[PDB]
Symmetry: D2
Subunit: 191 residues, 4 copies
């Protein structure tokens, strides 16, 4: 009854956009800076944010902040969080793992001279963790249905691939998500 | 029916310890290095961890990883996550906020020359966010009962205070948590 | 001689060196990884082929001599070509100032949307540093009329400050509140060897 | 003269300067914030009282002269007191090496339990750097028999490498796999002015 507010970037909003695309939920994708910064300063004046951060998801009059929290909330509401107490935990635990490596990716750049370590050490290591998780479990990380963890893992590699998959299941899992019809469409349309 | 594995430090395990103390749950608090590192390497060989990280909470044969996930799991199980869908979200959102500032605290040190900015800019700003959240809501962040967010906020400042509260509610809230009998006891006994 | 600069096809930590060569009019080969191909493969092969101390670039090769670490290279060239200041104290001040540049420059490079630190960088870290530089320029009033950080000739510190703001500008918007600094950067940008290099870049 | 070093009551970025003064036998006042009181209040008052370029310490004051930025201070002292190498190339190499030290040292300082990067630092970042240093020592075989990074006299790079490992050791455990580096550090640790300073520290 929905507005997503963020910068004109994937960033930490993209996973939320992927969820809405998957669920088929209509919303206004509001992007600053399509002086992004002046616009953000104004938004903060206009809107009551808890921590002066975006993304913000506003549903009617209700303001939701913090991307990971928003993801968990939506996932519960729309049945992509796992179907048992243990499965809900595993999905969460996997997402936390994705968060660790995703941040590391966002902390690697040329100036810092950490690209080679990321490419050679950190990413292979994390990819191995994910591949093993897939092996343990027309591919899902959790149970026999899609969860937000699947989308998160797709999003992580999709992001990484923009800038910079030895991992057979992970590759297959990524292809599978990319080809879900709602996802494929979203992706094709995406700037 | 429970072992917590971590280093002999508060770190990211402390919030879990505070929850168990609050809930009155008996567990073995297993600390490496009471060559911490040799011991950790061995533990990783011995135990099947998803990401080769601690803390690990083992309940019977069940291995749980990722501190924030563990906290959410316990909180749901033991009714400290909020009593409505919206309240569960707010608790989560607050914890996410705590995570942001807690990390910043752990990223500030003398060598980096970022202590003054943290003390003068970042912490006051975050404390203001928390104070306002308390105002909005014989003190609780969420609803009218204790949630993990309360414990998290207590833990954050308690950590900060070891190394380095203008904020009346926050101070009062912190005192209140510190004085909950199970907490007070845990704290008095703690190395 | 045969001077070759090796780096990625980016400004990064190489650009100041490139600016120095431009300013001095030194010819060199600007070898850039990844202009067309996979930058990482090229870098990997380079490391195999060239004996680098730390497996890092930039690398400046003069003849068969291999020099590493951008700041060290900058200091070496600056001494050689008389852009390091003309007294012991002035040499120190240029070095001081560059050290300060490095600090804020590293911060800029650690700033991004995902990390949600853009607003604090724009709003609180950069203005503070811009203030420090503005004050330093004031102390050299003044000799100035021409804007130099140190003494009455150009030093690498001048180039470094120019480069830092130039780099920032590529990503983020004014220097309105910092007139001395703004004039200084403009002045550097208009030195003919520099203006020409920039236009062609 | 009246030489005063201002810093926190910590090693940090000051310690190398202190080691240099010890090695050279220069008397100075080692003023440390927070020995007894609130370090931040002391620092805040210092900044008000002293005109610092960047609102940072360390600060070295010689007479009324204020010098800032630890690396710049190290380079200035090293030139003055002949620990920077005795040729243009050797001066560059000592500087190169120090730049490398700074990189790994900063990483050590960014390593902690909360960030869960201790194992990668011990396991993968430090060994790699230790290797780089070990290889650099090998190149100076070579002159050595005495271990120096550069030429056949001590330079600040020697002190810097010693200091870096010493600092690491306070926090984390062997250098077993790096015999040249280990011997080098031991050798530095045993220079009489250094050994004495250390024992008293």
């Amino acid at each position: 009854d929905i507005v997503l507010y963020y910068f004109d970037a994937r960033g930490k909003a993209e996973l939320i956009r992927l969820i809405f695309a998957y669920l088929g939920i209509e919303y206004t994708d509001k992007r600053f800076g399509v002086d992004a910064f002046v616009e953000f300063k104004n938004f903060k004046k206009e809107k009551d944010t808890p921590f002066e951060q975006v993304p913000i998801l506003q549903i009617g009059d209700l303001i939701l902040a913090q991307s990971q929290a928003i993801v968990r909330y939506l996932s519960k509401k729309y049945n992509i969080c796992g179907e048992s107490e243990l499965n809900e935990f595993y999905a969460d635990m996997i997402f936390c793992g994705v968060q660790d490596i995703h941040y590391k990716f966002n902390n690697t750049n040329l100036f810092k001279q950490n690209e080679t370590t990321f490419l050679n050490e950190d990413l292979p290591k994390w990819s191995g963790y994910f591949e093993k998780l897939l092996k343990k479990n027309d591919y899902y990380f959790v149970g026999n249905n899609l969860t937000y963890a699947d989308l998160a893992v797709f999003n992580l590699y999709d992001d990484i691939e923009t800038k910079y998959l030895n991992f057979p299941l992970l590759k297959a899992h990524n292809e599978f998500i990319s080809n879900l019809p709602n996802i494929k469409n979203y992706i094709t349309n995406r700037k």
